[PDB]
């Protein structure tokens, strides 16, 4: 059977990025493409070779974006879009950050959101002193049906109970109107 020597291709090709916020330097110098992969095998070789999020220095980010979508809000596929925010306190750095990030990676590359997986652009983990965040990025805030389905399934996959609420925030609102004070378009 070819199953013995064939790599298992993923529906999409993904780019893993790294960013360290060194305010002394330019953002292009601070941003690095780690690599692209389009197989299960190539994903695990990469994941096993890099630091866990809980072991990164504060001010460090990882992102996974569909190949062809830049890790930038201005990108055609992101600028009308937004993200589900998972906000972690210092206690959850220890208990949830790594398992939640790997859940997120596999929800993206496993296309776990059914028909609406095409709305998913990528995901981002921010390691900060004041608290860590995981976000799934989708392409369009107006697709209420796709966005709330992605939200519900993410919550179920993470094992968050119904009392715990998460919000979806527009990229344009974040960058352009209200930074940290931007309000949720949706909750789940």
């Amino acid at each position: 059977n070819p199953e013995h020597y064939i790599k298992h291709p993923l529906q999409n090709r993904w780019a893993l990025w790294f960013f360290k916020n060194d305010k002394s330097k330019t953002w292009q110098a601070n941003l690095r493409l780690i690599s692209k992969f389009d197989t299960v095998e190539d994903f695990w070789a990469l994941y096993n070779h890099i630091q866990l999020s809980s072991n990164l220095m504060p001010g460090c980010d990882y992102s996974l974006f569909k190949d062809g979508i830049e890790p930038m809000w201005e990108d055609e596929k992101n600028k009308r879009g937004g993200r589900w925010l998972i906000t972690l306190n210092k206690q959850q750095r220890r208990s949830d950050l790594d398992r939640f990030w790997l859940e997120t990676l596999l929800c993206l590359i496993g296309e776990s959101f059914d028909d609406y997986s095409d709305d998913v652009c990528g995901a981002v983990v921010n390691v900060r002193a004041k608290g860590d965040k995981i976000a799934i990025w989708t392409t369009e805030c107006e697709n209420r049906e796709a966005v709330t389905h992605i939200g519900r399934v993410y919550k179920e996959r993470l094992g968050l109970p119904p009392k715990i609420v998460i919000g979806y925030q527009s990229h344009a609102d974040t960058a352009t109107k209200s930074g940290s004070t931007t309000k949720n378009r949706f909750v789940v």
Binding site: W27, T176, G179
Partner: protein, 128 residues
């Protein structure tokens, strides 16, 4: 505190230098953005400087015309504004940007500490 000055009325093609005297933190430490809001329009990122290394970036709308610069001895950033046009008419202020993965440039709302700004008006009109 961030306090900006140097504004007022200028004729098209004229020249201006804005100043932002900064206190509360060193500017060699962090990065500083010029941001502007035309009336009715939304926030627009203008230019960024990292004083420590003196690296700069500009919005496309101002490249070749405006120059951001700084003095760590004075803890002040400047914006030289040459070849001014009507469209440069805006309140111009400084802020410390909070860049992160996906949010690098054109993040004028992504600022913690914020100046009140200085109104710049570019017009060849003779009415208010």
């Amino acid at each position: 505190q961030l306090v900006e000055s140097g504004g007022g009325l200028v004729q098209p093609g004229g020249s201006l230098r804005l100043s932002s005297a900064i206190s509360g933190f060193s500017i060699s430490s962090t990065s500083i953005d010029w941001v502007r809001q035309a009336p009715g329009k939304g926030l627009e990122w203008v230019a960024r400087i990292s004083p420590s290394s003196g690296s700069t970036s500009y919005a496309d709308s101002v490249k070749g015309r405006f120059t951001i610069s700084a003095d760590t001895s004075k803890n002040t950033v400047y914006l030289q504004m040459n070849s001014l046009r009507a469209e440069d008419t805006a309140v111009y202020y400084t802020g410390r940007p909070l860049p992160e993965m996906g949010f690098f440039t054109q993040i004028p709302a992504m600022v913690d500490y914020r100046g009140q700004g200085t109104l710049v008006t570019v017009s060849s009109g003779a009415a208010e």
